[PDB]
Amino acid sequence: AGMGTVMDVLKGDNRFSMLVAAIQSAGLTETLNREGVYTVFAPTNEAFRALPPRERSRLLGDAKELANILKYHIGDEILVSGGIGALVRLKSLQGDKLEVSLKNNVVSVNKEPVAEPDIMATNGVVHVITNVLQP
């Protein structure tokens, strides 16, 4: 049935919680605050813990550096596992492209595997990632 927007799902999950904090601090909430089509990759606790001391100390210290990276985690095209097929060039809200592919029934974005895909929301889809997406 679903609950609400992608934001509603992200706050219902303990792993997406830190992402909600980044989204809030960067000011990206207004994007997911609208209904339509979106594909959000939400990093888990492991992803944020795997972040290097140098990078995560810098990135999480500035709202603008946060906002920039968040725009790369949100795709502008809804591609679920059953919709991808083999490989698709998905555009992100940053302007760059996410190389999302499905091979051996394993979905991966920029080589990074998805932990739990095809999370249905009212305004798009959410793909759980255990890694962060860095250009």
Side-chain angles (χ1 to χ4, degrees), residues 13-43:
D13 194 289
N14 300 87
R15 302 162 293 196
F16 304 163
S17 186
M18 293 76 63
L19 176 64
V20 181
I23 294 178
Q24 288 183 151
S25 186
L28 261 295
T29 314
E30 292 288 67
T31 303
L32 306 316
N33 187 28
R34 296 297 304 172
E35 303 186 81
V37 299
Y38 292 103
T39 300
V40 186
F41 294 94

Side-chain angles (χ1 to χ4, degrees), residues 50-61:
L51 277 173
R54 308 303 301 187
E55 284 158 65
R56 74 188 198 212
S57 179
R58 175 66 189 231
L59 213 292
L60 298 173

